[PDB]
RNA sequence: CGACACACGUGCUACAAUGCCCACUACAAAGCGAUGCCACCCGGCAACGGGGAGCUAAUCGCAAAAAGGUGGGCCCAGUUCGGAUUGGGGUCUGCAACCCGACCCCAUGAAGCCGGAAUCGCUAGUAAUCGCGGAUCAGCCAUGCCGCGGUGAAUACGUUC
């Protein structure tokens, strides 16, 4: 996985929103196409509307899941099923 | 073995060396 | 169980008898017995009294094993089948993890194929 | 083939005994091309026999395999609406070629565990006159005899 | 109770794996074990071995709050 | 374009002892190589990292070939067979490995005991089996493809089908 030389990267931008938000007064309903960036510890509580090539799925982060990336909370597939 | 990792010819069959297969 | 938690079968290598454990394997092997000083050669069943809780206590505090080794991988999944992520509904329907293929092979998390 | 009678390979007589026939059965042994090994598990189990049997094992295996020489195998002739079994005089190339092709056939049966091992003592036996290797040979060649109805149909 | 059909008790020492001797009785004058009670974590406060965690991860991360604002 | 209750095709590995592992010891070729090939040194169990000499390349490098051999272990088990699966832990590339990269280490070791009807290849350095190069190429999901050599059989009565 990415490497640990190189730090956890967010796109900087969808960095700027969060923060914005951490201090100056959250939360509001970001729309993010940030899927790479990684789910960060200033974030939990917003709730970013990540996209997934359609729509924006909401996603309200919590103390239980960051580690991983913003592509791996808004599904691409939708699959009920065969049959 | 050929398929298999934890081994000298398992990584020789797939070209990389390790701790069984030292360089 | 004369190995903590479990019963070691005999007549065989202690090195390589040790893997019949949860969470025991070869590159564990010869750690304790190198840490006990164990000559690997030597049978289970050969053992000495004193060896066997140097063989066995070491092993008993410096890694998890068995139960409480399944104790935890099952959270770190049940977790991701809680906060649902891609590995989350890989595991939530019992399908492929690694990006590994989905319209055919993958018949270990699929098991025999149910008809249609 | 459709053009005329094949060649007979000669092969190299072995390095040991200086016989071709020696030459001819590693080959069965050899697998994979592995002349190396299969050159041991031959004079190997050339060793094993040596000490369970001291006469020169070169002559045993010289005689276990006259008896699992076949003298009458059956070949399926289908004329009109049947294929009969019909039995034909098989050759001398093929004898050879069908006792070279059960005693490993019946080695490889053999139930213990090493090559060699296994190897030898299907020699022997041949040489007494006991193990499956004479099996196929004496269900073959009676067959045949119990086909002996079809003789006119040879070839 | 009927003579005959009960395994007789008679006093019993059982061993834990903790050094913990339990001065019992018992069917067997000798019985060794690989936990006792005085040993085991439920029973031992709040002994959590090797995962006393804290559940730091995932808000926690935080290598590098390098990032601007 | 990598989906996925299914239904075929072409392969990889296999199900073991003429075998698996560890270490030790020799033997090719045709190729490729300048923000390329990477010597030797050092960090780390490692992938790899960092230093650093050499090569516009019959010099120098990739680089070791493997099957093999010489020793020791494994004593017939779903095993020291198989490495699928999954967790955990990183590298490296790349702006970015979440669907979606591969390389390294740990633990887990699933099905499979030669496979029904049916079917494929090959006739001599062939089939078998070992491994190696290159093109495509940031990395590459390559078991492919085109090439390269190593070791090395069986069999062909005959033409009815
Ligand atoms: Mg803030
Ligand atoms: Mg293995
Ligand atoms: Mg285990
Ligand atoms: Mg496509
Ligand atoms: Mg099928
Ligand atoms: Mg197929
Ligand atoms: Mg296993
Ligand atoms: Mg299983
Ligand atoms: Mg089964
Ligand atoms: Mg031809
Ligand atoms: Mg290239
Ligand atoms: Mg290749």
């Not at chain 1, 969060?18 to 939990?44: F, Q």
């Not at chain 1, 919590?62 to 939708?78: D, Q, S």
């Not at chain 4, 190339?93 to 005693?103: D, E, G, K, T, Y």
Request: aromatic share 8%; net charge positive.
């Amino acid at each position: 996985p990415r490497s640990l030389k190189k730090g956890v990267f967010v796109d900087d931008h969808l960095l700027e929103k969060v923060l914005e938000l951490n201090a100056k007064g959250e939360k509001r309903l970001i729309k993010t196409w940030s899927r790479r960036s990684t789910i960060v510890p200033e974030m939990v509580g917003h709730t970013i509307a990540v996209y997934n090539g359609k729509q924006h799925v909401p996603v309200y982060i919590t103390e239980n899941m960051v580690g991983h990336k913003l592509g791996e909370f808004a599904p691409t597939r939708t699959y009920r099923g065969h049959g | 073995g050929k398929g298999d990792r934890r081994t000298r010819r398992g990584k020789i069959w797939r070209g990389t060396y390790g701790k069984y297969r030292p360089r | 169980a004369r190995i903590a938690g479990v019963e070691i079968p005999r007549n065989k290598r202690v090195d390589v008898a040790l893997t019949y454990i949860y969470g025991i394997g070869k590159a564990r092997a010869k750690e304790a017995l190198e840490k006990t000083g164990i000559n690997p050669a030597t049978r289970v069943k050969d053992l000495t009294e004193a060896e066997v809780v140097r063989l066995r206590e070491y092993v008993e505090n410096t890694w998890k094993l068995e139960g409480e080794l399944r104790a935890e991988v099952a959270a770190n999944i049940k977790r991701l089948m809680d906060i649902g992520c891609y590995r989350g509904l890989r595991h939530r329907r019992g399908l492929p993890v690694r990006g590994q293929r989905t319209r055919t092979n993958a018949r270990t998390r699929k098991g025999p194929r149910k008809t249609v | 083939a459709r053009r005329r009678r094949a060649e007979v390979r000669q092969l190299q007589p072995d390095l040991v005994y200086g016989d071709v026939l020696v030459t001819a059965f590693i080959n069965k042994i050899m697998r994979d091309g592995k002349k190396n090994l299969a050159a041991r598990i031959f004079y190997d189990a050339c060793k094993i026999i040596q000490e369970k049997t001291g006469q020169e094992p070169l002559k045993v295996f010289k005689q276990a395999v006259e008896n699992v020489k076949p003298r009458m195998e059956v070949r399926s002739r289908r004329v009109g609406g049947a294929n009969y079994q019909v039995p034909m005089e098989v050759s001398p190339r093929r004898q050879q070629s069908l006792a070279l092709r059960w005693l490993v056939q019946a080695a490889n049966q053999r139930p213990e565990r090493r090559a060699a091992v296994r190897i030898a003592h299907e020699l022997m036996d041949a040489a007494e006159g006991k193990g499956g290797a004479v099996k196929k040979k004496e269900d073959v060649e009676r067959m045949a005899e119990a086909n002996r109805a079809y003789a006119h149909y040879r070839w | 109770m009927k003579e005959g059909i009960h395994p007789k008790l008679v006093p019993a020492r059982i061993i834990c794996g903790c050094g913990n001797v339990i001065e019992t009785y018992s069917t067997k004058p000798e019985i060794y074990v690989e936990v006792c009670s005085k040993c085991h974590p439920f029973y031992t406060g709040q002994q959590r071995f090797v995962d006393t965690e804290g559940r730091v991860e995932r808000f926690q991360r935080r290598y590098g709050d390098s990032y601007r604002k």
